[PDB]
Amino acid sequence: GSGLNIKENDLPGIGKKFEIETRSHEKMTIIIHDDGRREIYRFNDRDPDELLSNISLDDSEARQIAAILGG
Amino acid sequence: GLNIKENDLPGIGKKFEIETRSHEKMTIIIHDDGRREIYRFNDRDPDELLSNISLDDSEARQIAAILGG
Numbered sequence: 001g002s003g004l005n006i007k008e009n010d011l012p013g014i015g016k017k018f019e020i021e022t023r024s025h026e027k028m029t030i031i032i033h034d035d036g037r038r039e040i041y042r043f044n045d046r047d048p049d050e051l052l053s054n055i056s057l058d059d060s061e062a063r064q065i066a067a068i069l070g071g
Numbered sequence: 072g073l074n075i076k077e078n079d080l081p082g083i084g085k086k087f088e089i090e091t092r093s094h095e096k097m098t099i100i101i102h103d104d105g106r107r108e109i110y111r112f113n114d115r116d117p118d119e120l121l122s123n124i125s126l127d128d129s130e131a132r133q134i135a136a137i138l139g140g
Contacts, residue, residue, distance in 0.1 A: 004133060006137075020137075022124065042111070053111045058092065063138075064075070065138065065139075066136075068101075069138065071132070
């Protein structure tokens with residue numbers, strides 16, 4: 001369906017994983033590590049096995065980018 | 072270091088060009104009407120787009136909350 005869909009999973013001892021599907025039907029996974037590290041993975045719209053891009057951010061970077069993204 | 076360059080796009084919105092500690096690069100366009108567009112480029116080639124995503128205002132805020140949490 002076409003709305004914002006977020007699936008959250010605990011990664012025991014490691015952090016939290018968020019799998020997001022947007023209204024534009026684009027796919028992203030965000031891992032938030034307990035130590036502060038953020039990892040974002042972008043996958044091919046129609047192929048989960050195909051990684052388009054990925055980025056690792058420390059805590060301060062993630063918060064700065066989040067401030068921009070969300071106003 | 073984390074480097075951010077902000078420009079105004081007159082009558083359209085704002086552009087943020089971001090370079091991270093990992094040397095990765097992204098451009099975020101924030102439209103006046105609330106749309107966000109995010110572009111990810113090759114670290115060494117500004118001409119090669121790795122990925123892009125379009126978000127509405129609500130989606131942007133929700134994703135920001137996850138990222139900044």
